[PDB]
């Protein structure tokens, strides 16, 4: 209720289950779910803190036995396989949500990871005035794109103080239905849960399933490693910081270790922000769940 949404009620398939990103909202898939269509549920799973109703949980683990309690609850017939998925971290509850299930007795029949980092452990980051300004400015335009004002279309350098209120005044501007003071709160109780799902992700340590084959897994790739932000479209150190990051890093092959029943899609998407809005990106997106979810 607080963390589970049915984003497409109806049909008589098994559902299709995906996981938020790092921002904790779900409404990047109501397009997916709209394509998949009438036949296949679409459930997913946003993270607690977004109604402000609690604190946003931190740690990966614990998110992940959260929404695994409820699907058990909900599916009580153990001989039904789960049908998992997710964008960025979403791709890693997925993971996890399959561990836990498989150390519970159930099977997962198919993982889709979009755009999924592997999780290194190693991102020691402390915050600063650039961490913040940026996933702040992330969190505006997910808000954005949250009621379709706009697109990923923040200076450098810019100091979270002054870049909270101009991300307020857009907002109205391009006509966010708030007063300033509520869309000034709503930023901030997002970017919290941002800010945890972020520390969530980079403490994270994956172990391995107890079924390594069982899911038939897709991963879809965006078209560069070394470019999670489009230089043409980000600036600052923070970008900077994450594309050198990635720049050495083969997040792909590092999954397929943990999954060996492999699918690769490499897609034209511009950037790690691009999967789910690239043309191409998204197609093939479509075209695999049809299959894998229409039987």
Known sequence: DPV???????????PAVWFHGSMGTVQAYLGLARA??????????????????????????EMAALYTRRLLA??????????????????????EVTRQLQLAGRRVESLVMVDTPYAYGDMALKDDDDTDS??????????????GLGDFSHRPGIDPAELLPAL???????????????LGQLIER??????????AARTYLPADLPHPGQPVVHYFARRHPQVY?????????????????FADKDCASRWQRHLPTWHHHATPAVDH?????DSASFAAIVRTCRELYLG
Do not use: C, K
């Open 273 to 277: 922000f691009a999967m789910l809005t």
């Open 168 to 182: 307020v005044r857009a907002g109205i501007d391009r006509g966010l239905p708030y007063t300033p003071q509520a």
């Open 229 to 245: 932000f489009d230089p043409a479209r980000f600036s600052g150190p923070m970008v900077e910081w994450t594309n050198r990051y």
């Open 134 to 147: 940026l996933r702040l400015a992330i969190v505006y335009v997910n808000l954005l794109l949250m009621n």
């Open 4 to 14: 589970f949404e049915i984003l497409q009620s109806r049909g008589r398939r098994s």
């Open 190 to 199: 997002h970017h919290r849960v941002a800010r945890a799902n972020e520390t």
């Open 74 to 95: 909900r599916q009580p017939d153990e001989s039904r396989a789960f049908r998992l998925g997710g964008y960025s971290q979403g791709g890693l509850l997925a993971y």
């Open 36 to 61: 998949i269509g009438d036949e296949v549920p679409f459930h997913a799973f946003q993270s607690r803190g977004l109604r402000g109703e609690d604190a946003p949980l931190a740690d990966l683990g």
